[PDB]
Assembly symmetry: D2
Homo-oligomer: 237 residues x 4
């Protein structure tokens, strides 16, 4: 099984699996049943921004999602990631559709990770920024239905030539290099991620969502994870 | 005026104004009587590192002070800086000596503040890093007894040619440009500061401390702030 | 007299002062008569980008100006800036109008300067990024007619409430802190600047241009520098 | 295949394959016979720094190698990397020993590449910084005899437990993620690399050198590349 820590932007309430009865953002620690959720006023067809931050001193994972001239939704959860994740991890973006569907377009993604060790002036850092995706983006491992390059964007799920999102799709984009997210002798370890997205549905209920995730480096899409499982979990427990 | 938020590295216990009876690190929100403290095992004559972090989503000001392969001291306090500080501030380093003394040497100092406002990708940022200070450090406002260029370092308090710290000294170094640390339409505002210091005392009785502070842009050393007031407060209330 | 090194985006050919007979970009070392110029196809009413770069190893000052889906114009000049400029300098943007006029709007500006000294891991750095300007931008010294905050933009020259650029205007925006652009013991000193602009004229010939400049820290707009002198030079020699 | 661009720090003169008869630094464009060299006063047993820079506007690859307060060696060569390299590359460090030997220790390594494309503000960037290497450095591909974690450093060639370098050794360390160093619609593409090394030889006769290189992503050490071929070339043509 993979170890997944994710920040989900869930557009479809699967009441039967623990979702709140509204679009929401949530912190998922190894289960799709979010440990904390916040009401999110998703704006169909508009470009939004999600900011995710964590540092080993506060041990608080927080995320803010906003649309220009709208209020933000923010959710935080106290978690000591050194007890949940392996030392080396891969980071990525995941999305899915099921009966209902929506485009899960990523227009930009940036990430920064820093390990500041005990003997200062011994920081290790990794930062990558994507403001354009190209047709053959060799630094991204694309899984499932994910593709790059259409209008210089990353399409996490299948969308037809005429712009229509397809149902029962699931895809993930993971950055190629392993990330050292924590290490025993660091006095401060922190990371921040930011991505802009465009979710638009034709049908009355967009589904299923987008998630920022951190996993074991060899993670792959689980069998049966389309729909409500966001291409992250094998079951809904 | 002046409004001060400071992270103090207090080496002398002034139990009459609320200090614990041991060297400590504390978060000072407009008063020398720290809102939160943590015991600090100050190592006389060794170079240590202080890391200060804050972000408006968590509204938690945290500081870590370590020495190469020694345990670190950490202190955190929940505070919404938008309700304490002006929008525009100046950041700096302060130090003082009283009847007892020590060298308050700064070997490097860096700071970073970022404001990610409402609109997709509209970020404002400021970053400066000094790993060596020159005799004519034009981008620093030196107040009191602070000098630069002695061995490529910043001396916040008076030291004599022979390397001996003087009593009743106070000095502060402020970065020249005003900093926008908060703004009403920012989705996320955050800052990080790091500095390495060397506190050395001829006898085993150092006083008074070093402090990283954020103040109104027009701040100047208050009268009588040597000693226990760290060059920061006018009184001990 | 001030010492000015500038990269001009000149929209009006003042043939009588040495300009080429077309819009052009040029490297100005202490004189408005550019040491090198390149033909520039200015696109009225479109947002463009200028990138300026220099490093002490190559001692080449280069600038590229482009508009999306258009060819860029680039100009380079070999100059050892340590022999032209003071060690400490202020950097800014300047613009002017004369009989003919245009808006000289800056939508974003970012700058990075680094001094890497001999004993490595002793780099000094300064970076600031502005993607939004506010009504009271305290970290910018505005000179002449320059104002900030209209649509979160920096207007270097006067433009009426109804959006009309005015003639005989000149204004400059300089970053507040002095910049150390070179120093005797650095093994590498480099800087890069980037700004996006929107120049639109109602009249048949926009004038006069925008310039990125580096000057002595106390520089002020010279008397008679509106029009063709870009608010940078006292005469046209 | 393989296509190699490298900056070599050559400590042993192989006058038969074109080396000057002194230790030198050189720019190698697909051949060990450097296109340009500069004399290097290699200081046995001291830690030195190498800085490599390149930007597509000037199309000039420059390198500076210095030692604390000693004169630096500089070498520059005009080359359009878009005509030599694939779009996607891997960057790494290489070293070898032959009949004579030395330690080829890397103490820190950082790299930064940025692509500023046509559209206002659409920049892609990659930055990694290693100031300490762990035994399990998962984001580095180690080829040959290179190992990490010995004292927090990268040993590119074989050293014995007692600190003695071995002959006929070759090893390379490549950053895990492919790097986009050039792209057809980029207005500006640039990269900077810095690394600190320590070359120590038991006798006063070190060989063979260390080299920073950029290659096709699938590059592996060529057969017989120990010694003078620096683990980079198959032959000496
Ligand atoms: C009706 O159920 C189907 O569609 C929804 C919405 O798309 C998914 O959440 C769910 O997994 C799938 O089984
Ligand atoms: C005994 O007092 C004096 O010396 C101590 C230590 O320097 C200071 O804290 C104090 O303000 C000053 O009055
Ligand atoms: C016709 O001349 C006037 O207008 C032009 C264009 O605006 C300026 O360059 C010049 O300085 C001013 O004297
Ligand atoms: C005399 O030769 C041997 O040793 C030298 C120095 O190590 C290498 O350059 C060379 O390739 C190898 O053949
Ligand atoms: Ca759901
Ligand atoms: Ca005290
Ligand atoms: Ca002109
Ligand atoms: Ca050789
Ligand atoms: Mn959910
Ligand atoms: Mn105290
Ligand atoms: Mn001109
Ligand atoms: Mn050679």
């Amino acid at each position: 099984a993979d170890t997944i820590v994710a920040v989900e932007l869930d557009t479809y309430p699967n009441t039967d699996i623990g979702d709140p009865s509204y679009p929401h953002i949530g912190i998922d620690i190894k289960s799709v049943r979010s440990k904390k959720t916040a009401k999110w006023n998703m704006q169909n067809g508009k470009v939004g921004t999600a900011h995710i931050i964590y540092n080993s001193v506060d041990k608080r994972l927080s995320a803010v999602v906003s649309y220009p001239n709208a209020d933000s939704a923010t959710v935080s959860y106290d978690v000591d990631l050194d007890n949940v994740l392996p030392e080396w991890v891969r980071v990525g973006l995941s999305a899915s559709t099921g009966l209902y569907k929506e485009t899960n377009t990523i227009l930009s993604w940036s990430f920064t990770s820093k390990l500041k060790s005990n003997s200062t002036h011994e920081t290790n850092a990794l930062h990558f920024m994507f403001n354009q995706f190209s047709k053959d983006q060799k630094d991204l491992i694309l899984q499932g239905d994910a593709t790059t390059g259409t209008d210089g964007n990353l399409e996490l799920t299948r969308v037809s030539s005429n712009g229509s999102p397809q149902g029962s799709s699931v895809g993930r984009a993971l950055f190629y290099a392993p990330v050292h997210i924590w290490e025993s002798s660091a006095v401060v370890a922190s990371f921040e991620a930011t991505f802009t997205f465009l979710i638009k549905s034709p049908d009355s209920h967009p589904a299923d969502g987008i998630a920022f995730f951190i996993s074991n480096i060899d993670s792959s899409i689980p069998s049966g994870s389309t729909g409500r499982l966001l291409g992250l979990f094998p079951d809904a427990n």
